[PDB]
Amino acid sequence: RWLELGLTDEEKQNQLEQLAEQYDELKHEFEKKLEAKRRKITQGDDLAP
Amino acid sequence: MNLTELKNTPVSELITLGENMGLENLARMRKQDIIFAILKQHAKSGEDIFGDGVLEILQDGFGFLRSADSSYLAGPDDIYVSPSQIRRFNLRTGDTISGKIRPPKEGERYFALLKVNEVNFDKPENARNKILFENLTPLHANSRLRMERGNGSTEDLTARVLDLASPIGRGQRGLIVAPPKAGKTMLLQNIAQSIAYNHPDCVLMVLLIDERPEEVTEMQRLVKGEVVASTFDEPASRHVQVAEMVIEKAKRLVEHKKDVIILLDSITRLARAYNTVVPASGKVLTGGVDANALHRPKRFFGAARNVEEGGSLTIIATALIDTGSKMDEVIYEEFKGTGNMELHLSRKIAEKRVFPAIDYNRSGTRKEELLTTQEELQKMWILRKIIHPMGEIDAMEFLINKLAMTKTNDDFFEMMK
Amino acid sequence: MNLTELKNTPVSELITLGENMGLENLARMRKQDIIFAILKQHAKSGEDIFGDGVLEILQDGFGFLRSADSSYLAGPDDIYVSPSQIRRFNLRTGDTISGKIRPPKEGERYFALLKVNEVNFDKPENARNKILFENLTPLHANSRLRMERGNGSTEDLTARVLDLASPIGRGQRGLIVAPPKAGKTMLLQNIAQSIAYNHPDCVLMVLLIDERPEEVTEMQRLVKGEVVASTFDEPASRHVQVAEMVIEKAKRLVEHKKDVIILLDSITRLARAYNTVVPASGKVLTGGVDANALHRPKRFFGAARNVEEGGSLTIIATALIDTGSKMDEVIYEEFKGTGNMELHLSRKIAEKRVFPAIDYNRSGTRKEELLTTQEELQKMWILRKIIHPMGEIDAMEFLINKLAMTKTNDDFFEMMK
Ligand SMILES: Nc1ncnc2c1ncn2[C@@H]1O[C@H](COP(=O)(O)OP(=O)(O)O)[C@@H](O)[C@H]1O
Ligand SMILES: Nc1ncnc2c1ncn2[C@@H]1O[C@H](COP(=O)(O)OP(=O)(O)O)[C@@H](O)[C@H]1O
Ligand code: BEF
Ligand code: BEF
Ligand SMILES: [Mg+2]
Ligand SMILES: [Mg+2]
């Protein structure tokens, strides 16, 4: 829960930021897939006129 | 690419840039989606994108970073922020954020934040170790605000009168009681010019609620400050939204040890918006007013204070009277014993074209001893004793006529003896 | 661990202790839940926990023990008490309780009481054998309160004037009639300092309703007493809540044979809160006032009395006039013939910067013969006869100018002959 620290910013914090950005992108993609599956399995089905 | 750069550009320059990019006709649609589409293109082929604004937390957990030039409005210009930032840097409602953004991917329409570069013009590391707002220890006015420029033009004298009628300092609550057609607009304009000229270090903000768009336009390009306003062609939702956002921005900024001074005109229109947006709680007052409809305006007005630990927040809200409604009187009566700096503008003097029409006898400031020296405050007392037995119009006549020849206020005090 | 210990600590010390405990960032949230979380941790690893406060009974049967530093507000700091205590020790609204507490178990969020150590600074055994409040036999003022310190500083003379204008004793009802901008704030401040310096044995409480937070802050750390107040950024619910809790605390404390003296400023704002919180009963008066909206303020004011069986309750509530509304006059007229100690502060003298501005001619005290000796009261009568034919301003001029040179009040009486 403490992925974020600070030491020798010039490159260490750069790599840590790249990693945190990749993590945020991964979480966003997972949430997108989650909501897509949700709205797909919860959308109103057509039955008959 | 910076967002504020395209922001300070007029619409014609955005049109020219979009036509230089060779796209579909962009001049046809909103400035909002104009900037949106040109940013989408230039970010399809361009660097990292940069942006800045103020953050508002939604009830879904995520947040929206909006611009003050759009008066913090919802639209394609906004920057989406995830709750993961609000857990990592523990973001807050009203934080001045500036950082890197990117285009939205498949199915998304809001630009996503990449890395916070400046949080309230400060370090995110230093954004943790901060002090809470109401957890602060308020204090009386300690440092006085110098409004006298020293040049003595046609309008500067107006400010000088204030300097001898009701001195203001950082952390003081100012309330202006004036009927319609009394000249309060350029009163605030001259005050803002003077406090922006004398103190370029404190961030200065104004607020216009239910105001005409002409004054909004002429103000947003004449004085310094993020001139945010709320025109009457929008419902109370937008007005209370501006209230929330700018009051939270000021709160965060004083929490960051900065002196913020907020100019509101008028507080009665904002309170009316609060009343018409808040649900009815059963208790009605005279004129269709809710008892709970004044709670949030009272919060907004009392947010200003002088912090001991650092920074300060001074509010100057104007109040309307003598306009006939029930709400104006009930609100002004509710707010009378709240502010510690009354400025009364009598229309009885404005009808004679004697500007500024200031009720010096009915005006004053409590705890004014902590703003001026002993002899300054003594001269103020002697002059108040001299001018008090006089009427209203003749009082301002003598004041303005004697401040016309002498040019510095202490010289006026000297010559008054 | 005592709760009041962490209570008297500033927020910075709580932050340092929480960081010493090595937890999640606690400086981010309320002082309320700051103390809550640090207590939860230190009680996960720590002794029995101890706490203290005032109890309020809920309509569910249970009760909440709250703190006066939070002005008896609802939050995680509160201590839950079961109705089984209210059956065993037969607890009551407004009891000063102090006892052992523990963390809440699974699913609970309020600290639970273990064993009452002190009930109103007294034994629970002796908490049974007590006398009811209205069941007491009221009496007139028997013992006078000495407000003169004897040093004669710049402000102490103010109190001395009261000692010759309207003597106060335990059980007397004091009502201050003053317009805005009359200097009543530091009037109560000097009175509180004098009665806290002369009588450290009687528990002294003040009440600020709809007051500015600056005065609340400067008062809660300058005088002795549980300085409880109610700022205007909360609705009438909180104000009437403070009214209930502190009046019940004073009632229980005088029931325990203790002299309680309550300082309220102002009674008109509290009555306005009562009006705007009470439901409408159909009968409106001039200015949107309910007939039943004054019943509870009248109860609050008349609660003060001088008990024969032991202890006493003296209330000093201030009233506002000359501020324009309908409510101020209707309330002051309703409360005029209620209190037996009028103190009138004329703004006509405060406009001349003659402090304290006291209307000696229009002031007085009924049954003043039971507070001073024969010659003291005779000298008071002779001086009243001397100063009554004079005006207002010149009256206070002579009073203050002749009390300036002499330093003890009886010496002033002697030299006045
Ligand atoms: N300092 C000043 N210098 C020049 N003209 C002024 C000044 N103050 C007021 N006025 C006059 O007063 C009018 C102001 O109108 P407005 O701002 O709408 O007043 P209000 O807001 O009280 O209705 C202008 O027409 C202007 O000529
Ligand atoms: N004893 C005193 N000595 C000097 N100045 C005083 C004294 N009492 C009052 N004042 C003046 O009166 C003002 C009191 O302000 P305030 O407390 O708001 O009055 P009030 O409480 O009556 O509204 C101050 O500006 C102060 O200069
Ligand atoms: F702005 Be005006 F006083 F209507
Ligand atoms: F505090 Be002042 F009397 F309004
Ligand atoms: Mg105007
Ligand atoms: Mg006062």
Interface test with B, best of C29, C185, C209, C214 (most B CBs within 10 A): C214
- CB-CB neighbours of A21 under 10 Å: 14
Q: Are the CB atoms for B23 and B15 separated by under 8 Å?
A: no
What domains can you pick out in chain C, each with its CATH number? 1-126 (2.40.50.140), 129-417 (3.40.50.300)
Declared resolution, Å: 4.1
The partner residue sitting opposite C235, judged by closest CB among B131, B138, B295, is B295
* Surface-to-core class of residue B201, CB atoms within 10 Å of its CB (0-12 exposed, 13-18 middle, 19+ buried): exposed
Query: Cβ(B409)–Cβ(B148) under 8 Å?
Result: yes
Q: Which of A24, A32, A35 to mutate to test the interface with B (most CBs of B within 10 A)?
A: A24
Ligand 5: distance of its center to the CA of B215 in Å? 8
Q: For residue B180, which atom of ligand 3 is closest to its CA?
A: 3
In this complex, the residue of C217, C235, C277 whose CB is nearest that of residue B138 is C217
Mark yes or no for CB contact B366/C323 under 8 Å: no
Other Cβ atoms less than 10 A from the Cβ of B5: the count is: 9
Strands (E) located in B16-171: 49-57, 63-66, 79-81, 96-102, 111-119, 138-139
> Which residue's CA lies nearest to atom 3 of ligand 1?
B155
Q: What one-character DSSP code corresponds to residue C212?
A: -
Query: Which DSSP letter does residue B368 get?
Result: G
Ligand 3 in reach of B181 Cβ (< 6 A): yes
Q: For chain A, how big is the Rg over CA atoms in Å?
A: 19
Report residues near ion ligand 6: CB below 5 Å.
Answer: C 185
How far apart CA C276 and CA B125 sit, in angstroms, is: 46
- What 8-state DSSP symbol labels residue B220? T
Which listed ligand is nearest to B351 at the C-alpha? 1
Contact present, C5 and C51 (Cβ < 8 Å): no
The H or E element that residue C306 is part of is strand C305-307
- The token duo for C391 is 């005006």
- Is B172 a known ligand-binding residue? yes
Tokens of B161: 């009168």
**Closest to C101 in 3D by CA, of C77, C119, C120:** C77
C-alpha span between B55 and B40 (Å, rounded): 21
**d(C-alpha C63, C-alpha C55), whole Å:** 6
Q: Do A21 and B82 touch (CB under 8 A)?
A: no
Angle between helices C11-21 and C31-44 (to 10 degrees): 40
Please tell me the distance in Å from A11's CA to the nearest CA on chain B.
15
Q: Is the CB of B180 under 6 A from ligand 3?
A: yes
Amino acid at B196: A
Strand partners, B52: B98
Maximum distance among all Cα pairs of chain C, rounded to whole angstroms = 77
| Beta strand B49-57 pairing with B79-81 | unpaired
Q: Which residues contact C383 (CB under 8 A, 6 or more apart)?
A: C164, C413, C416
Angstrom CA distances, B344 to B90, B154, B158, B335, C35, stand at: 43, 21, 14, 14, 45
- The DSSP-derived string for C365-404 is ETTGGGTS-HHHHHHHHHHHHHHTTS-SHHHHHHHHHHHH
Query: Residue B167, SS3?
Result: coil
Distances (CA, A) of C310 to C94, C133, C260, C313: 19, 11, 12, 10
Q: With contact defined as beta carbons under 8 Å apart, do C94 and C248 qualify?
A: yes
**B82:A24 CB<8 A:** yes
| H helix or E strand, kind and range, residue C410 | helix C409-416
Rounded to the nearest 5 percent, the helix, strand and coil shares of chain B are 40, 20, 40
**Residue type present at position C59:** Q
Helix (H) or strand (E) holding C185: helix C185-198
**B182 among the known binding-site residues?**
yes
Residue B174 counted as an annotated binding residue: yes
Contacts of B377 in chain C (CB under 8 A): none
CA distances from B234 to B241, C125, C268 (A): 11, 66, 38
DSSP conformation letters of C43-101: HHTSS-EEEEEEEEE-TTS-EEEE-TTTTS--STT-EEE-TTHHHHT---TT-EEEEEE
C-alpha C153/C-alpha C151 separation (Å) is 6
| B71 and B21 Cβ atoms separated by less than 8 Å | no
Structure tokens at C417: 């002959």
Distance CA B364, CA B157 (A): 18
- Quick check: helix, strand or coil at residue B155? coil
**CB–CB of C171/C314 below 8 Å?**
yes
B230 C-alpha vs ligand 1 centroid, how far in Å? Answer: 21
Distance CA C297, CA A42 (A): 58
- Shortest-distance Cα residue to atom 20 of ligand 2: C183
Two structure tokens written together for B178 = 């004036």
Technique used by the depositors: cryo-EM
First to last CA, chain B: 62
Cβ(B311)–Cβ(B255) under 8 Å?
yes
Q: What are phi and psi of C136, to 5 degrees?
A: -70, 165
Instruction: Using alpha carbons, list the distances in angstroms from residue B352 to B289, B321, B380, B393, B394.
Output: 35, 19, 26, 8, 11
Please give the Cα distance from B19 to C397 (Å, whole number): 82
CA-nearest of B266, B243, B336 to B56 is B243
Which residue has 């009562």 as its token pair?
C274
| Separation between Cα atoms, residue B186 and residue B109, nearest integer Å | 42
Cβ partners under 8 Å of residue B20, min gap 6: none
The two structure tokens encoding residue C33: 């839940």
What does the CA dihedral B39, B40, B43, B45 come to, rounded to 10 degrees? -120
